[PDB]
Amino acid sequence: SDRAMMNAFKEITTMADRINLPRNIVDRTNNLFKQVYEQKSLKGRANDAIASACLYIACRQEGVPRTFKEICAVSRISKKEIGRCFKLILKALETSVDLITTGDFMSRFCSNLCLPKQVQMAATHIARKAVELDLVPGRSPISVAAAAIYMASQASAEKRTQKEIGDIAGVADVTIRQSYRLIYPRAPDLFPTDFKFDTPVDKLPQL
Amino acid sequence: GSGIVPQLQNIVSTVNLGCKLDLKTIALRARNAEYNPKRFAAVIMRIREPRTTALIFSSGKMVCTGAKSEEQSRLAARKYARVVQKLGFPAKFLDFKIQNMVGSCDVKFPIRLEGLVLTHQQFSSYEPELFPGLIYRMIKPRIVLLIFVSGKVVLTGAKVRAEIYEAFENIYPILKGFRK
DNA sequence: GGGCGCCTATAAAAGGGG
DNA sequence: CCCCCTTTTATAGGCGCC
């Protein structure tokens, strides 16, 4: 019955393809799964839940983090159960993962939003500075990234909607408005010094 | 010394009344009772002093929740046992025991969770997408702490008051080393 | 936009039900 | 083996819904 791994790898494969994940990721996921499985460390749970958590871990270990929401999307399991398994697995395998950062999502988010490299860089910059100046303490890095992207895009010709960004980043627009409100007071100090302001820093949305 | 004493916020204790009970009658006769077996298998009762809430099971065992001290939890526990007694049941008060204690306090300065999770990964879990606070599972004493960037700290899992105090003393130095 | 009330997480007991 | 039910509490970001 342990060769139920095959069914796990199939499921892993399925999920991975729904979001076109490179092979290194799927391989890592399979290894993680095999290791946890053979260890019999997480008794009483559902294999697909474990597999989905393994997937989530793999993306982070391979340096390109997916949010739990994203892994949830391609999975039959809930965020809550994936999260529970996630923590349980790190402990069983005596592993860890680097804390997530705003930068970890800047690339993919901006791509999905079809934003020009120039904006992507501005956002990335705004987020990093914002955190450095401790403007958004306690906020999720995903939230801060979403707000930075919003700020950036609104200062560019390629403007984006709180709703648009929120759908791609997987955060509610009020969540965006909250972080945005916190970074807005320092907008001038947050953009890259040589930035082409389609909309002047002032005329920026005053949520 | 931290010079800070964590404040007890909640105590959970159990006691055995010894005799089997009939929730329906209790629920009916008792004033501040409540019983919906469809919803939950026990009677929920509440006294205002000690401000508490109890869970009474037909087995005769009950759970006392809400007290801010061991003394107060036991006092309330007895008052509960009394109303049951007074409604005509061979109620005793066997094996009263504190099962969990919760404490909380403020180290008074912001904390760099990012840093703490870096050097303490072994005991930490800090995932912003899952919970805004860092979850610290201390081994000695076996207490779990919830640490927030604001400097507020919650401690739980204690069987005795000392465990709460000890865990906070153990964590204070660590936290100080991560002050913003 | 504003804001209430609940989600998430911690410990633990009770005793079923799944 | 695990989860849920429910109660209590500090703590607090995120978010459904009116």
B11: nt with nearest C1' to CA:
D8
Residue nearest to nucleotide C11 (CA to C1'): B157
Report, in ranges, which bases of strand C sit under 7 Å from a protein C-beta.
Answer: 1-3, 7-16
**Is the distance from CB of B102 to CB of B168 less than 8 angstroms?**
no
Same domain (yes/no): A130, A85:
no
Residue B124 Cβ < 7 Å to strand C: no
Residue B170, burial from CB neighbour count under 10 angstroms (0-12, 13-18, 19+): middle
- Distance between the alpha carbon (CA) of A77 and the C1' atom of D17, Å: 25
Q: Which of A7, A19, A104 is nearest to A62 (CA)?
A: A104
**Distance between CA A112 and CA A169 in Å, rounded?**
9
Q: How far is CA A183 from CA A177, A190, A195, B101, in A?
A: 10, 8, 17, 40
Pick from B69, B98, B127: which residue ends a domain? B98
Q: Which of A60, A149, A59, A130 is nearest to A98 (CA)?
A: A60
Helix (H, G, I), strand (E, B) or coil at A60: helix
**Is the distance from CB of A174 to CB of A148 less than 8 angstroms?**
no
A140 and chain B in contact, CB less than 8 A: yes
Same domain (yes/no): B103, B178:
yes
Residue B156 Cβ < 7 Å to strand C: yes
Same domain (yes/no): B105, B178:
yes
DSSP H helical ranges for chain A = 5-18, 23-39, 47-61, 68-73, 79-92, 103-112, 117-132, 141-154, 162-169, 173-183, 187-190
Sequence-distant (6+) residues with CB within 8 A of A75 are: A15, A48, A52, A55, A82
- Distance between the alpha carbon (CA) of A140 and the C1' atom of C3, Å: 21
- What DSSP line would sit under A129-179, residue for residue? HHHHTT-STT--HHHHHHHHHHHHHHTSSS---HHHHHHHHT--HHHHHHH
φ, ψ at B56 (rounded to 5°): -105, 125
Pick from B68, B98, B128: which residue ends a domain? B98
Show the domain range for A15: 4-100
**Distance between CA A199 and CA A192 in Å, rounded?**
15
Total domains, chain B: 2
Q: Do B127 and A142 touch (CB under 8 A)?
A: no
Q: Which of B104, B100, B138, B72 is nearest to B8 (CA)?
A: B104
**Distance between CA A143 and CA A137 in Å, rounded?**
11
Q: Do B180 and A134 touch (CB under 8 A)?
A: yes
| Strands ordered across the beta sheet of B43-45 | B43-45, B53-56, B61-67, B7-16, B94-106, B152-158, B143-147, B134-138
Same domain (yes/no): B89, B129:
no
Same domain (yes/no): A79, A141:
no
Q: How far is A175 from chain B (nearest CA, A)?
A: 12
CA angle (A117 as vertex; A111, A118 as ends), nearest 5: 140
Record the resolution, in angstroms.
2.7
Q: Do A100 and B128 touch (CB under 8 A)?
A: yes
**Distance between CA A58 and CA A93 in Å, rounded?**
13
- What DSSP line would sit under B34-96, residue for residue? ---TTT-SSEEE--BTTB-EEEE-TTSEEEEEEESSHHHHHHHHHHHHHHHHHTT-----EEE
Pick from B98, B119, B145: which residue ends a domain? B98
**Distance between CA B133 and CA B149 in Å, rounded?**
7
**Distance between CA B41 and CA B38 in Å, rounded?**
7
Nucleic strand D interface residues, CB < 7 Å: A 43-45, 80, 84, 138-140, 142-143, 170-172, 174-175, 178-179; B 9-10, 12, 39-42, 44, 46, 51, 53, 55, 63, 65-66, 102, 104, 106, 128, 131-133, 146, 148, 150, 152, 154, 156
The H or E element that residue B116 is part of is helix B113-120
Same domain (yes/no): B72, B39:
yes
Same domain (yes/no): A66, A88:
yes
Residue nearest to nucleotide C1 (CA to C1'): A207
Same domain (yes/no): A121, A171:
yes
CATH of the domain at B78: 3.30.310.10
Q: Which of A39, A29, A92 is nearest to A61 (CA)?
A: A29
Q: List the beta bridge partners of residue B147.
A: B134, B153
Total domains, chain A: 2
Q: Which of A172, A121, A193 is nearest to A151 (CA)?
A: A121
